[PDB]
Amino acid sequence: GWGNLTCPICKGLFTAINLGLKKEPNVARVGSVAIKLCNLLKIAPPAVCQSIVHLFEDDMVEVWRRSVLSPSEACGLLLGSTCGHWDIFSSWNISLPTVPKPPPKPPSPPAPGAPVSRILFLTDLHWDHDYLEGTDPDCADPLCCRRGSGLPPASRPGAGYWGEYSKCDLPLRTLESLLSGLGPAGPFDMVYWTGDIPAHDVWHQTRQDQLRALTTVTALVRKFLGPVPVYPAVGNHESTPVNSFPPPFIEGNHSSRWLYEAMAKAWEPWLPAEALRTLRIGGFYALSPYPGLRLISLNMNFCSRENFWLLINSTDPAGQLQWLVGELQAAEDRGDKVHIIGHIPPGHCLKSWSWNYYRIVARYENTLAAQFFGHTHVDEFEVFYDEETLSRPLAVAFLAPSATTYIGLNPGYRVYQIDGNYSGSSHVVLDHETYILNLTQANIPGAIPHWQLLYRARETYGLPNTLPTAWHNLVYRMRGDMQLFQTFWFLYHKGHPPSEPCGTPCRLATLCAQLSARADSPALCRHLM
Amino acid sequence: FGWGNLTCPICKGLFTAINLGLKKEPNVARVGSVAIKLCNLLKIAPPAVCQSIVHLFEDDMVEVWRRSVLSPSEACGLLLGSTCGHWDIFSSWNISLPTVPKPPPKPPSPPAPGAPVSRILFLTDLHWDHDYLEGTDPDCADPLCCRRGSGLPPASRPGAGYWGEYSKCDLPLRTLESLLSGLGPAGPFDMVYWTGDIPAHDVWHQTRQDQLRALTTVTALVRKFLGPVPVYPAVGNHESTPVNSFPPPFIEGNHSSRWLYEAMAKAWEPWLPAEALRTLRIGGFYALSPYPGLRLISLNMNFCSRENFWLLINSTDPAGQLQWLVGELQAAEDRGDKVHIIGHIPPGHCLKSWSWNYYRIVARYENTLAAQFFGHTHVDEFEVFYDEETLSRPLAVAFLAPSATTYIGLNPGYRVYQIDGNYSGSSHVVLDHETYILNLTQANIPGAIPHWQLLYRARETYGLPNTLPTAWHNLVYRMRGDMQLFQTFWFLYHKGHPPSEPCGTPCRLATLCAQLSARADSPALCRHLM
Ligand SMILES: *[C@@H]1O[C@H](CO)[C@@H](O[C@@H]2O[C@H](CO)[C@@H](O[C@H]3O[C@H](CO)[C@@H](O)[C@H](O)[C@@H]3O)[C@H](O)[C@H]2NC(C)=O)[C@H](O)[C@H]1NC(C)=O
Ligand SMILES: *[C@@H]1O[C@H](CO)[C@@H](O[C@@H]2O[C@H](CO)[C@@H](O[C@H]3O[C@H](CO)[C@@H](O)[C@H](O)[C@@H]3O)[C@H](O)[C@H]2NC(C)=O)[C@H](O)[C@H]1NC(C)=O
Ligand SMILES: *[C@@H]1O[C@H](CO)[C@@H](O)[C@H](O[C@@H]2O[C@H](CO)[C@@H](O)[C@H](O)[C@H]2NC(C)=O)[C@H]1NC(C)=O
Ligand SMILES: *[C@@H]1O[C@H](CO)[C@@H](O[C@@H]2O[C@H](CO)[C@@H](O)[C@H](O)[C@H]2NC(C)=O)[C@H](O)[C@H]1NC(C)=O
Ligand SMILES: *[C@@H]1O[C@H](CO)[C@@H](O[C@@H]2O[C@H](CO)[C@@H](O)[C@H](O)[C@H]2NC(C)=O)[C@H](O)[C@H]1NC(C)=O
Ligand SMILES: *[C@@H]1O[C@H](CO)[C@@H](O[C@@H]2O[C@H](CO)[C@@H](O)[C@H](O)[C@H]2NC(C)=O)[C@H](O)[C@H]1NC(C)=O
Ligand SMILES: *[C@@H]1O[C@H](CO)[C@@H](O[C@@H]2O[C@H](CO)[C@@H](O)[C@H](O)[C@H]2NC(C)=O)[C@H](O)[C@H]1NC(C)=O
Ligand SMILES: *[C@@H]1O[C@H](CO)[C@@H](O)[C@H](O)[C@H]1NC(C)=O
Ligand SMILES: *[C@@H]1O[C@H](CO)[C@@H](O)[C@H](O)[C@H]1NC(C)=O
Ligand SMILES: *[C@@H]1O[C@H](CO)[C@@H](O)[C@H](O)[C@H]1NC(C)=O
Ligand SMILES: *[C@@H]1O[C@H](CO)[C@@H](O)[C@H](O)[C@H]1NC(C)=O
Ligand SMILES: *[C@@H]1O[C@H](CO)[C@@H](O)[C@H](O)[C@H]1NC(C)=O
Ligand SMILES: [Zn+2]
Ligand SMILES: [Zn+2]
Ligand SMILES: [Zn+2]
Ligand SMILES: [Zn+2]
């Protein structure tokens, strides 16, 4: 009978497809057809389509050939079981160590006169380098206010001197202003630097340009902050194409070796030997700023939904989660405490990665003191609960607003007051402050650039402390009180909220976001009606 | 604005490049060879068979996959869906019956005493090997044995019988000569319905020339022995090569089926009138009027078939034939005549939507449709149709006739139906039927003379007041109750040569459930068997 032939004909078919598109000419064909389709969907002008697709085609086809179309996979998709196996984005688990979990003990308020560690948090600087004042703020292009955007017609003004309120990342001068005005204050013990150094022009980006951004902005930070250590993390716009972060099992040229070795060449002064070693492989590391404290810098792109290399293998990329566990357990032993920093927050991640992270923080509550994440470009947080009943806040991650202005925001940075350096310190965020540059004032001719204080957390929300329970109570408190949420919304946008009023469903969506540290998991929002 | 928007265009371009890539013959060769190695890996069957069969399928197979499954997209509509591409493969469809209101139901009236009767001979699944060779190995490693190249049986196993064999072998032409020669007793026939499957079961090395050989020589044989009596054939699943390949009319030659359809109507020109030949050259189905007041429809069930891969491209009412059928059936309702439907594969072995639309049609046209005949099963059984609303009322039954061929351990056999005869007011419904078989245990003895015996008669054997559908329904549930009776139906099921295994309760249930399922993917139909 013929029924037996379907499977072999399928496997052979995708073998011929596989080896067939491994040749460049067909890759060119896919590129051009994709260009015509891009032109059909419009958004954006044709040259952008051309450049972007020419940039993506190679690695895109590479991964699809090695993942989606690899027979099989594909035959396991169309037939399944008997023929092939489709594992794409399959579930996986990281297997915590067998050490029994110590009983949860919440941290105690710091003793009077105890030391305090001030930490500067910079994220999403997004340096354009093509920013040109006077250009068109609203143009047809993924990014405007830069060389090649043209001029605004008639009554619409050009881009501001310090940056603009539409699209338009920052010119280097505004980063210089940010770093010069750091005095008051200040002084900082350390700086957490999340990533996203390059601008949002993703179609024509080049490795040389990305390296330019990384090295020059690193040099700027280093110039202004001097001896204070800066601990960076890898953002989602560092590599090119944007979001392309092949795990360590991909080897050059097309691997990430270039970016990871450009880093750790630039960050050599800040990071110790081991940190650099692990950074050269996967782009993540661990170190000890204080005795009794451990900082973990995670590469969240192996977390990312938009990182297509995960189609190939999405299972604990670079084995980093496991590594993290080894560290966190290493921290439980020794009686130390851990700070985690990263670009993309957990709960923006795929499915399994997020759940494994949640499982880890829940297991490691007493050890993990704080967590910091960027990427959102807006000011918000995320609350973690116990994995069983999800009724008890065990930790919170702080999502800091972007230094960049991207999509209509005032620039800003954050500063954390944290339990300081000494034995027994909890190393937990005591408070935080948010500075912004009001562009309406700063762009006036003759104005004096000023980085104002905006708000202080505890002062604004009346929190007895910054521990998770307080943020939980703040969320449910805002569900009820609309004025309070209006405050949180004003600060959410760094003082430049949009024109749309953000009515009731908007509020509900936002608060639900504040409560979801685990991707999917709709139940986390159950108590919000 | 980010890469996430590009996935769709990159996909569509990807599968365009794949499409044009495997549109070249060298790549087709590569897929063929990989498939050959895989076949050898799964074993079953010997390597030469794998090689030949895949070499026969590869061309058209790649054609269809390129044009359907992999056509971007489709494929992209599968991996992304909705917003990007549309995946319709084996999607639902409906035939839209005409708006004429259904006439009020009513049972056919019993024929008056002394009324005329039309005897019809039903031949199906002749499966002529032409390579059948007595003495060769009946059980060999091969899809088909008892032929040239099967070798000799080792040691104690005897060879193949002169008149055919009881394991995995088709018929030699001489046994078809025997069948057609012994047709006298009895009786005289008014017409002959011939379902299909003329060529043998060797599907790996088949060639168009061979299939046409079978068609023309066997057609010539039937015409020789039955002479002036009309034979209305149908297209079986073994005609075209590769087996089951029946591209709809929207596929054009060379690789289309026009060669087979025009080879027919060249061979069947004496039997079928002009229109029949015209539509048969297109779709392989036709309509004609054997009697005044009666209409015979011959459907090509390959557009029905699950095993026909050309439907991957478009599975929706191939050749628009179902619609055509409606147009004919309605034409009869206004005209007040009755319809006989014949085809190879029975409805309920068909895909999903085709089957359900067929059920809907027969249900709508019940009073008009007098009888239905189908082959393919190679075994003696039937299928009962119910009302589309409550599914409690049998509105019709289709008769699945046993095979003339011996394929898979059966005595050869043919059937003859007694039908309400030619006259005004005739119901044209099956009154009874008979089944003749050639017992090979006796016929293959040296010096024996092949004899085609009577086996059973329906009404007498099952004690049915008539052959109308209600009778067969009552028979099925009676068999659910009575195990001895089912044992009878099982003996006749195999044409008098039931297997060694006792069958029994789960077997019985499966068989009866099959008898009640005329619509594929209709498990509810068997609910009442518990
Ligand atoms: C239309 O399509 C047909 C199927 O693709 C194709 O039939 C093929 O014809 C060739 C040449 O006659 C045969 O060639 C093979 O077999 C013959 C006879 O055994 C040998 O002489 C050859 O060396 C070779 O082995 C194929 O067997 C035959 N395929 C089948 C299965 O029918 C027609 O030729 C096509 N016609 C046109 C217009 O190209
Ligand atoms: C096809 O031909 C077969 C051989 O003629 C025949 O099988 C034979 O059937 C008879 C009985 O019909 C068996 O003889 C039996 O007779 C006594 C009578 O008292 C029984 O008690 C015994 O069971 C005894 O078996 C033969 O033994 C048997 N021979 C073989 C080879 O099986 C089939 O019945 C015929 N089948 C059809 C469908 O006609
Ligand atoms: C290595 O990395 C990628 C291939 O994955 C490729 O882009 C490099 O070649 C350069 O890439 C530039 C874009 O980033 C492109 O604009 C430039 O023309 C091209 N050529 C060079 C030498 O810069 C690959 N280069 C290597 C090391 O072969
Ligand atoms: C954290 O505090 C400890 C003291 O509690 C500091 O360690 C001292 O460092 C000085 C040199 O600057 C040595 O002379 C002392 O002997 C050290 N004492 C101990 C107990 O280690 C440490 O410098 C502080 N860490 C940071 C980063 O400021
Ligand atoms: C940023 O600057 C603008 C202008 O200086 C502030 O908006 C002003 O708010 C006052 C409140 O009474 C109004 O009377 C003015 O008309 C506003 N000016 C304009 C042109 O909008 C704005 O509040 C500042 N943002 C913050 C809070 O830092
Ligand atoms: C599949 O085939 C049919 C033609 O048989 C295509 O369009 C149908 O054609 C019939 C007859 O002309 C019309 O009466 C129907 O209305 C049509 N149906 C639909 C759903 O459009 C149909 O487009 C083909 N589908 C594919 C996959 O191309
Ligand atoms: C069906 O019966 C009809 C009569 O109802 C038969 O037709 C007659 O055939 C004879 C012999 O040729 C003619 O003399 C008559 O003129 C015919 N009458 C009509 C009205 O057709 C016919 O023989 C039967 N048909 C078949 C196929 O048996
Ligand atoms: C087809 O596949 C099944 C296993 O899925 C195998 O057991 C069987 O032998 C194959 N069919 C034939 C006719 O060999
Ligand atoms: C993905 O990585 C994990 C961890 O090594 C391992 O199962 C294997 O390398 C990959 N799984 C696959 C290829 O399915
Ligand atoms: C593994 O993680 C998944 C999420 O990816 C979670 O739903 C599941 O409970 C875990 N599975 C096992 C077998 O522990
Ligand atoms: C593609 O781009 C446009 C404009 O950036 C956006 O509105 C749209 O949502 C994108 N496509 C999808 C499917 O989201
Ligand atoms: C008729 O088509 C509709 C969808 O338009 C579908 O829901 C229904 O099941 C179809 N009817 C049949 C008998 O398939
Ligand atoms: Zn960013
Ligand atoms: Zn980012
Ligand atoms: Zn058959
Ligand atoms: Zn058949």
Short mmCIF file of C-alpha atoms and ligand atoms in Angstrom, two decimals, chain B residues 190-191 290-292 422-423, ligand 7:
data_model
loop_
_atom_site.label_atom_id
_atom_site.label_comp_id
_atom_site.label_asym_id
_atom_site.label_seq_id
_atom_site.Cartn_x
_atom_site.Cartn_y
_atom_site.Cartn_z
CA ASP B 190 -31.33 -7.27 -18.80
CA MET B 191 -28.19 -5.25 -17.94
CA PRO B 290 -31.55 2.02 -19.23
CA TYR B 291 -35.37 1.96 -19.00
CA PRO B 292 -38.05 4.60 -19.58
CA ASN B 422 -39.58 -2.00 -16.64
CA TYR B 423 -43.04 -0.38 -16.64
C1 LIG C 7 -39.22 -1.37 -21.54
O1 LIG C 7 -40.61 -1.44 -21.85
C2 LIG C 7 -40.92 -0.70 -23.03
C3 LIG C 7 -42.44 -0.57 -23.10
O2 LIG C 7 -42.92 0.01 -21.88
C4 LIG C 7 -40.35 -1.39 -24.26
O3 LIG C 7 -40.41 -0.48 -25.37
C5 LIG C 7 -41.08 -1.06 -26.51
O4 LIG C 7 -40.22 -1.92 -27.27
C6 LIG C 7 -40.86 -2.53 -28.40
C7 LIG C 7 -39.89 -3.45 -29.11
O5 LIG C 7 -38.90 -2.67 -29.80
C8 LIG C 7 -41.38 -1.47 -29.37
O6 LIG C 7 -42.13 -2.11 -30.41
C9 LIG C 7 -42.27 -0.47 -28.65
O7 LIG C 7 -42.59 0.61 -29.54
C10 LIG C 7 -41.56 0.08 -27.42
N1 LIG C 7 -42.44 0.97 -26.69
C11 LIG C 7 -41.96 2.00 -25.99
C12 LIG C 7 -42.99 2.96 -25.47
O8 LIG C 7 -40.77 2.16 -25.78
C13 LIG C 7 -38.89 -1.80 -24.09
O9 LIG C 7 -38.69 -3.01 -24.82
C14 LIG C 7 -38.41 -2.04 -22.66
N2 LIG C 7 -37.03 -1.60 -22.57
C15 LIG C 7 -36.04 -2.44 -22.30
C16 LIG C 7 -34.65 -1.88 -22.39
O10 LIG C 7 -36.25 -3.61 -22.00
#
